[PDB]
Amino acid sequence: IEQPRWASKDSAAGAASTPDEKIVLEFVDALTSNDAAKLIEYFAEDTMYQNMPLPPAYGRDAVEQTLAGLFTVVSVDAVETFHIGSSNGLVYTERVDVLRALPTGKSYNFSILGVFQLTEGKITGWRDYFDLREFEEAV
Amino acid sequence: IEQPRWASKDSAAGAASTPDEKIVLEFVDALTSNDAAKLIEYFAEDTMYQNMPLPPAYGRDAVEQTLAGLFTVVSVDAVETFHIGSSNGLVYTERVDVLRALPTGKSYNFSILGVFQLTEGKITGWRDYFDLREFEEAV
């Protein structure tokens, strides 16, 4: 919601300055679409997606199924990206995702640090790190 | 212990290539000392440390106290760093910390992505993102 005190303007989302950073930034903003068919276009054939340390999805089919399933029980109401940066082929997003459980109407604020690996502008790897204590309940 | 399928040589720990990266790498390795007095020497006076999204510690005194408390209940048995990188004044560590609860002798693997901010070679901010649902039991 509001800017954390440790937020550094040097690495703000609006300061994204490589084509990979801009692609990832556009991707995480697209999560509010709740549309697995839209989102899967960002992924390479050889790809991976994981909420650490839950079982990963490898391959674009498995990733698409995971996202599709997520969006049947949960709405991504908001994504606020505080930092974005990149280094050695990896892109990092420090952000908050707001998830709303569809059956209960309850919403959850997850503080996430995600790492992305892109190959020719397509997502080859995506791993989100965050507290899963409420993620289970949010199913 | 074992290298993950998604480990990328281009961002491997052995390839750290800025002063900040090397300092941060040295710091996380030093975690296995379990020595708050040793570890606090890496932090600036104006600083913070947080296991997201537990309450943060601001200021070198609060950080030292938090680390001291930690090491009275937990041993950091191993730290394995898969990736290190940096961008826009932030350093990122994708790693695994193995923690052993001292009263139970139970050990835990935490998959962690951490971000570090440094000023004149000193830690100005440290935020670790990982699953905390074993952390409650661990600490």
From Swiss-Prot, chains A, B:
Belongs to the limonene-1,2-epoxide hydrolase family. This is Limonene-1,2-epoxide hydrolase. Changing N51A: Almost no activity. It catalyses: limonene 1,2-epoxide + H2O = limonene-1,2-diol. GO terms for molecular function: limonene-1,2-epoxide hydrolase activity. Changing Y49F: 15% of wild-type catalytic efficiency. It comes from the Bacteria. Induction: By growth on monoterpenes. Monomer. Pfam families: LEH (PF07858). Its EC number is 3.3.2.8.
